[PDB]
Amino acid sequence: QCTGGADCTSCTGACTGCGNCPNAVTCTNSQHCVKANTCTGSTDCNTAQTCTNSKDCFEANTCTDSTNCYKATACTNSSGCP
């Protein structure tokens, strides 16, 4: 459901190493984590509050090694910060 492979659409828990996690609350090394609240090494973390080495963290308050952190008040080696 939540671990490995190309698609984890039904995962609402912790997604790990999976190629599509649009409903997961946490992502580690996963893709398309549009609903996650925390991301590590993951993509499209558009609503995450915390990102580490992740992409498009438009809502995060905390970003490290991450991109497009529009709201991050803690911004380390990240793009797009206020």
Place this chain on the structure above:
Amino acid sequence: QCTGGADCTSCTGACTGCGNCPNAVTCTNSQHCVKANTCTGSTDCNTAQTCTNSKDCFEANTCTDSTNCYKATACTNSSGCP
């Protein structure tokens, strides 16, 4: 395993929300992550290179909201930084 529970000693990948992750290479919201390279929300991250809201990051190069970041060159709201 790696997600949830009291004991994730068997986890050699990433822990998420687990009470004991001594062999994990990544931790999120987990305890005793003494081997983790990356920690978020986690404890005992003694060998992590990157910590976010984690504890005892004695070897991290980068810390945010973390403790005892004794050699961190990127240091945001963290204790013990050089």
